[PDB]
Design a protein that fits this description.
part of a larger assembly, 6 chains, alpha/beta, TIM Barrel, eleven-stranded mixed β-sheet, 11 helices, 37% helix, ALAD_AS (chains A, B, C, D, E, F), porphobilinogen synthase activity (chains A, B, C, D, E, F), lyase (chains A, B, C, D, E, F), porphyrin biosynthesis (chains A, B, C, D, E, F), zinc ion binding (chains A, B, C, D, E, F)
Chain lengths: 323, 323, 323, 323, 323, 323
C-alpha cells in the first residue's frame, strides 16, 4: 500500500521498542506505604490485600531495614492504633504511634526518606479523618490537630508530613505549625487531590479505620476534574513541597492535567483497591500480576507522576524487577 | 482559621455534590461488546470474565433483543470462529461469522447501532491480528483483508466498521474499500490508539484467539504517550469517524490529551482485564462492585471519552443503575 | 462524490445522535428562582412571565415542599417586600423577609439547597440595588449592608448568599462578614458577571423593584466581553464559591470564555426576559415551548455552565421532562 | 472600604460607558434576509414573524431599491416557489426563482451585495433540503444539484452562493461547479455550522418549506460544540469565503470558539425563532423591542461575528437606529 | 526567616535528590556511532578524539559483537573509504562500504539496531556531502544518489537510513526510493536539523572527509532557531521516523522547542567536537570526565531527546556506568 | 526533483546567510567575570583556565581600565581571600575584599557596570557557600549574611548584587537589606537557576574556594527542568532585577523555557568548565577556538539570554571580534 507513515517500524523488535520507550520506571519512583500496628507480637495479614501484612511495632526496625536493603528509598507510615479516642489525640502525643513509627524508621535507617501519613481516621473512635462535631468533621479543629501532629511527627524524624485528611487549609496550617515549632526544613507531601473514592475498601481493613459512613464531606467528588486541579493548586499556593493525586489508577487524566499546571513534584497513590484488583484477578489467573503491575505503574509515570505510592514496591524491589 | 477558600463547602451534602458533579454517565455513553460463538447450542461462560457468556449464534437474535430492551444503544460484535485458517478468510466471506453477527443484530433490532470488530485474531490459525508472513504480521496484506471484511460487514448491516488489528493505514484502507464498494455512509470506529496491553488476558479466553506470542510489533507500547496521540491523529487524518483509546482504565491521561487534540468523538475501551480486576476483587469482597464500576466508568467519562466499551453495560442497564 | 469525511454519518438516527450528543441536561443543573411576597393571601400572577406566580409567604412551606418533591435541588429566593425604606433595611433584619424565606425553606426541606438573592432593589424605596447617595448608588455603604444581610440570611439557613447588586468588592465584603459572624461554611454564589441588560423587564414586575431609571452605573455594559471576564475573575480572587454570568442566553460566549478561564463552578442565569421571550412566542404558536426551552437550556450547558437559574425548572421537573 | 479595583469607575456616566464600550454595531454588520414569492400580487404577512412580509416578485425591484436606500448593504434571498417538484429543480433552472431574485436584485441595485440562499427545502415537494431517496436525504445527489443551482444563481448575479442544506462537501461541490462554470470570482457564504434547531419554526411559514418530519439527519445536533467547530473548519478547508453559525442567538459560545479557530469571516444568523421571540414578547409588553434587538445583535457581534443575518435589519436602518 | 517555599528541602540528601530527579539516562537512550575503515589491518586512533578508533572492516564483526555485548542497542555506521570519486558512488554500490558495514553488523548481531549514516562526504573526492556542480553541491542530483544509497544500505540490513547530507527533500527522496525498492519497513532517522557547526572538527579526521571549504550552503546557520524548527518539521511532513538535532550540546534549546512541536521521536547528536572538548579538558585535569559526560548526556535527555548519538556510549556501557 | 520548499535557497552565500541570521552577538551581551586576589603582587595564572589570571588587587584599577577600554560594559567581581573564617565575614566588612573590588572598579571607571558576586564560598574556611551548621549549610543564617554583604557591596559602588550561594529567599533577603539600608536603587542580578554542576571544576582553582565535599544540598539538580524554572520564577516573585541560568552551555533548554516564562532579563553563565573545555580542545588542535566560542556564545543568545557571563569577553573585545 502507499503509506509513507508507518508507526509499526519502531515496534519491530524488543530493542527498537526499548530505544523508543518514552517512559521509565525505577525504584527511585516508588514510595512504600507501611502499616505498623502497636502492641502486637505477630504480623497480621490484611485479607483484602493479599501479601500485605500489618507490621508489629516491635518488628518495625527489622522491616524498615529490610525495606531499606531492597533499595526502597522511602516509606509512608500508617499506624494501627490501640489508643483511639474522640479526637485521635495519640496522633499528636510526643510518643504516640505516629512519632514512634517515624522515630523507629529514621533511627534504624537514617537515610530512609520517611513520610508520615498525617490524619486521624486511624486514631479516632468514630473513624473520621478528624474532629467530629454536630456539623460533621470540623475543618478548623482538625487543622489545629494536624498541626500538632505534624510537629511531633517532624520532631520524631519524619522527613515529610503527609496530610491525608482532606481538610481545607491543611497544608497552610501544618506549614505554620512546623515553622513555628522550628521545623522549617520539614517537608510537606500533600495529598492535595484526594477523592472520595470507592477504591479505598481494603485500606480500612488494613489501617483499622473505624468509620461507619463516608468521607464525602471532605474527600472530593471523583467526577470533578476542574475541582481536582484547583484542589492541588491551592496546595501549591499554601506551600506544599510535593502534590499528589489519590487514587492514581483511575485518575491519570488528573495527574496529566496537574502535571501541565504546576512545576511542583507530583505524587500519585496506587490505592489499596487498585492493589487488590490486581492481586485478586491475578490470583484467579485472569491476568499476569507482574505485567499488570508494571504496566499500571508505568502508566502512572506516563501520566506525569514523579512518585508513586505502591504496596507492590517492596516485592518489585526484592524480586529485582525494578532497581 | 482564616481560610477564605473552602472547597468543602460544596461537598456538605448529597444534593450539593450532585449540583456540582462535573461529569455524567448514562446509557448513551455505553457500547456493549458481545461475544458470539457460531455452531454452538449452549451459552459458554468465560471463566476469566465472571458473568460474561459466549452467546451461541442461534440465541443471538434473542440476546440482541434483550440487549436492546435494556436500553443498550449499541454493541461491538466479537466472534468465536469454527472456521479459522491461515488468513482468517471467514472474516471476509459474505456469510462468514462477521457478517452474520451484524446481519442478525440489525435485522432483529434495526435501530441497534452495530459496530463490527474488524480484525483477524479470532479467525486465524496462528491467532495474530492479520496475515502472517516471515517478517511477522504483514501490514499491507492485512489492510487488503480488512478492507474486504469491512465491505462484507457493512453489506451485512454494520453501522461501524471497527478495525482493532493495529495495522498502519487501516482506516484509510477500510474507508477506500467501503467507498468503492458503495458504503460511503458506513462509519469507522477506529481503535486508533490500541496498546500492547497486558490487560487483554481474559479476552483471549473469551474470543478464542489462538495467539502464542505477542502483538508488540503492531499494538503500541503502553509507555508511549506521544506516539499514542500521533496514532490517533493519523487516524483522524485518514478519515475515522470516531477515535478510541484502548485500554481506557490505565490510559486516562491519553484519553484526556487526545480530547484536547481533536474535535472527533473519542471512544474508550474498558478492557477485559479491567472488567476482570473489578469482578475478582469484588468477588473476594475487597471492593464494592457497583461503586467501583461506576467510578471506573465515570472516570473514563471525566477523562473526555464520548463512548465507553464496557462489558458491564448490560448489567448496569438491566439493574437500572444507569438509564 | 469523493468525500472521506462525512459528519452526517453520526446523525443518521436518533440512537446515533444520542450516542454522540456532547452535552447533557438534568435536574442537577437547575436552580429554581422563587418569588415570595410577604403579607399576602393569594398567589399573584406575574403577567410578564406567563405561568410564574408570586408565592404568598404563608404558602411558602407548601410550595417549597412541592418544589422539593418534583426533584428540584435548589432555589434562589426573591422577596416582594411590604416594608421598604431608603436603604432596604428589612433585608438585614433578623426576621426580615430575606431571613424568613430562607428559614421557611430550610426548615421545611432541610436538604433543599437554599440560595438567597442578596440585594436591596426589592427592599428600597427608590428601587436601586443599594444605598442611594447624591453620587448615585454608593458602593461601600451598600457593601456594609450586603454583609449585614448575608449574616442574617445565613443565620436563617441560606446555603448560599448570592449577591446580585453588582457592587464592587461585594464578594469580599460578604465573605468577611460571614466569617466574622461565624458562618465560615456559608457559601457565596456570586452574580459575578451581571450585565445592565434589557432582558430584565419582566423581573421588575415579578419582584417589585421600584426603580425609575437604570442600573448602568453598577451593572456592566452588555458589550464588554473583556470586562465581563475580569469581573468574574475578581470575584474568584475575592473567594466566591461559584461564579455566574447573567443574563445567560445572549451571553454564551462569555460563559464559554469564563469556563476556560477558571476552575470554579459557573452558574448562568436564564433571565426573566429570556423566559418571557419563549413563553410569548410559544403562546403565539410561533415556536414549540418545550423544544425551545430544552435547546435554550442545553445551549447554556454547552457553553460551560454548571448550574442554570431557570424559571422553567419546576415545570420541567414536574412534567418529568428532565430528571 | 479598601478596594483598589473598582470596575464601577468606568460605568459612572453614559460618556464613560461609550468610551469604554468594547463592541460596535452598524449597518455594515447586517445582511437582510428577504422573502420573495413568485406569481403573487400582494405582499403576504408572515404571521409567525410580525412585521415580516413575503415580497411578490413583481414588487421586488421596488423593495430592493427601498432596502438599498435605507443603507442596507446586502441581502440573503429566499424564495417561495409555485413550481416545486421531487428535487426542487426550479432552483437550478436558468430562470427559476432563485436566478430571478438574484438577477432582479443585482440589476436594480448593482452595488447591492446579493447572497443567494442555496438549498432545496423551499422547492421540493417533500420539503427536505435536498434529494429524497429511501436512505433519506441523499448527500451526493444533493451536492450535484447545489452545484447546478450555484452556477445559475451566480450567472444571474449573486455575489455569494450560500448553501444552507447542511450537506457534507457542499462547499467543495459548489466551488468546483462555480469554477468550472467560469465563476471563479463568485463567493461562498457557507452556512458552515447549522444546527437542527427548534428556532426555525417561523421560517417554515415564511419560506414555505413543505417538510413534514425533521432535518436531524443533516442539520447537526444543537448540543455538539466540538462537532460544530469541526463542521465549520471543514468548510474553511473546502474553500468557503465566509463561515457561519446558525442559529446565532443561543450559540454565541460557538461563534466565539470558531472566531478563535479561524481567520475567515464569520457570519451569524439571528433566526426566525429569535426574531419571533423578541417580537412576541415585545408585543406583549414584556420587553422593550428596540433595546432587546440591539442587545441581541450587539451580543452576536461581541461573540465575534463579522456579519449578522437579521430580519430587523431594514427596520433598524430605516428608523435610523443603526447607520 | 519567614520562607514558606524552600526548594532546598528536597536536596537534603542523595536519596531525596534521587526521588525527585526529573530526568533519567540509560543505555536505551544511546546510539553508538562507529567508524569503519575498509582495507586496513590495524585500528587507527583518531587523535582529535582521544579513545576513539577507526575499526578495520576486518575487525568489524568482532567490534559489533563487543558493542552488542556491552548492552549497546544500536550503532550509526560511518565509513572511511579507499574508493572515493567525484560523486561518492561507492556509497550506492551493492557491495560498497556502506552496505558491508550494515551487512556485517546485522549478520553478526541480528538484534542490533543498525543505522546507516547516509551521505557522500566520506566517499567524494572533494569531500562535500553530495554532488558537486558549478553552482555548488547540487541538491537534486544528491537526492537521487541518497536514494540509491538508501536502497543498497537497506538491502544490506540497515534498520535506519540516516541522511546527514543536509539536502532539501532528502527524507522524501529516500522514502520514495525505499518504498519503490520494496523496503517500506526501513526507517528513516533524519538528521533533520543539522547546523553548519564548528563542533565537527574532529569528525573530519575521524571519518576522512576530504572537504576543503565549508558546508554553509547546505548545513544551516547555528543561529537560526526558527529555521531549525522548520527544518525538522518539514522532515516530519516528508515522513521521517525520527528527527534529530545536531549538534546537540549547544542546541538544547532547539531540542526543547522541537520536542514541544512534534510527537515524533527526537534524536540528538553529541558531536565529535563535544566529545573532544570533554576529553581534552578532562585530560588536562580541568574537569572530571565521567561527571561531565553524564551531565552532558543527562542535559540532552532533559531537553527532550529520546536518543543520543554519543561516542562515549560504549565506554559508559562497558564501565557499567549506565545500564 | 519537485520540491517547492528549499531552505537551502537562503544559505547560498555569506550575504544571504547574514541577511537571514536570526541571532546577534555583541559586546552589549557580555559581562566579564574578574578574579581579584588581595595581598598579592603578581598576576596568578589559573592553570585550569588557560589565559585566565587572578588580578592582584593592586593592579585592579589598571585592569578595570583596560577592561573598560576594550569596550567591556560590565564585570562580575570574584575575590580570592587572605582573610577567610568560619562564616566568610570579610565579605560583609565595610572594607572587606568584596567592597574594595567594587569600590576600586567604580571609582576607576564610574560608567562600568559592576556586579558583585555575592556568596561566601570564597571567604569561608570550609569553602561552602554559606554558614556551616550541623545540619549543613544553614539557609537562614546565610541569608542574613548575604544581606549584610549586599549592603557593604552596594555602599561600595556595586550596581548589582549577584547572589550565587543558591540559598532559598536570598533575593528577598538581599532586597530587604538593600532597601532598609537605603540602597533601593541597587539591583539584584540573581543567580536564580544555579545547578550543582560538574562544570565548575576550574572555578575552584580560580576563586580559591576551600570546599571539600559538594553543594548538592543547595545548588539544584542538573536534571531538574521543572524545578529549574520554578527556581527562577520564585526569584522574579522576590523582586530580582535580572534572572540567570548557570551553567548556560548545557542548559540552553532551560534558558529557552525561562525566556518564555518571564519578561525579566535573563543572564546566562558560561562557566569555567565550559571555558576550559573549549580552551583545552582548542589547545589540542581539535577545534578552532574563535569559531567555537562565538558559536557557543551565539547559541546562548539564541536560547534567549540577554546577558552572558563569559571569561572570553575581554579577549573577544580586544581582538575586535565583537564590538
Ligand atoms: Zn497501650
Ligand atoms: Zn484519614
Ligand atoms: Zn485541599
Ligand atoms: Zn461450520
Ligand atoms: Zn485482533
Ligand atoms: Zn494506527
Ligand atoms: Zn407588615
Ligand atoms: Zn438588585
Ligand atoms: Zn464585580
Ligand atoms: Zn408559474
Ligand atoms: Zn434547506
Ligand atoms: Zn458541513
Ligand atoms: Zn579496494
Ligand atoms: Zn556528509
Ligand atoms: Zn532539511
Ligand atoms: Zn591582610
Ligand atoms: Zn558560593
Ligand atoms: Zn532559589
Amino acid at each position: 500500500t502507499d503509506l509513507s507513515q508507518r508507526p509499526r517500524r519502531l515496534r519491530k523488535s524488543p530493542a527498537l521498542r526499548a530505544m523508543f520507550e518514552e517512559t521509565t520506571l525505577s525504584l527511585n519512583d516508588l514510595v512504600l506505604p507501611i502499616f505498623v500496628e502497636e502492641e502486637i507480637d505477630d504480623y497480621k495479614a490484611v485479607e483484602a490485600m493479599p501479601g500485605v501484612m500489618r507490621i508489629p511495632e516491635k518488628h518495625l526496625a527489622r522491616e524498615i531495614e529490610r525495606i531499606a536493603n531492597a533499595g526502597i528509598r522511602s516509606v509512608m507510615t500508617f499506624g494501627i492504633s490501640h489508643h483511639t479516642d474522640e479526637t485521635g489525640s495519640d496522633a499528636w502525643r510526643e510518643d504516640g504511634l505516629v512519632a514512634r513509627m517515624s522515630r523507629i524508621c529514621k533511627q534504624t535507617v537514617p537515610e530512609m526518606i520517611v513520610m508520615s501519613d498525617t490524619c486521624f481516621c486511624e486514631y479516632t473512635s468514630h473513624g473520621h479523618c478528624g474532629v467530629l462535631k454536630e456539623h460533621g468533621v470540623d475543618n478548623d479543629a482538625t487543622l489545629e490537630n494536624l498541626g500538632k501532629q505534624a510537629v511531633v511527627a517532624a520532631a520524631a524524624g519524619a522527613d515529610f508530613i503527609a496530610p491525608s485528611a482532606a481538610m481545607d487549609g491543611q497544608v497552610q496550617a501544618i506549614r505554620q505549625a512546623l515553622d513555628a515549632a522550628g521545623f522549617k526544613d520539614t517537608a510537606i507531601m500533600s495529598y492535595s487531590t484526594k477523592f472520595a473514592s470507592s477504591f479505598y475498601g481494603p485500606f480500612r481493613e488494613a489501617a483499622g479505620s473505624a468509620l461507619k459512613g463516608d468521607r464525602k464531606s471532605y474527600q472530593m467528588n471523583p467526577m470533578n476534574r476542574r475541582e481536582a486541579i484547583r484542589e492541588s493548586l491551592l496546595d501549591e499556593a499554601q506551600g506544599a513541597d510535593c502534590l499528589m493525586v489519590k487514587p492514581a489508577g483511575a485518575y491519570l487524566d488528573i495527574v496529566r492535567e496537574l502535571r501541565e499546571r504546576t512545576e511542583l513534584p507530583i505524587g500519585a497513590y496506587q490505592v489499596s483497591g487498585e492493589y487488590a484488583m490486581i492481586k485478586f484477578a491475578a490470583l484467579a489467573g485472569a491476568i499476569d500480576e507482574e505485567k499488570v503491575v508494571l504496566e499500571s505503574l508505568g502508566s502512572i509515570k506516563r501520566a506525569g507522576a514523579d512518585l508513586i505510592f505502591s504496596y507492590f514496591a517492596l516485592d518489585l524491589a526484592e524480586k529485582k524487577i525494578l532497581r
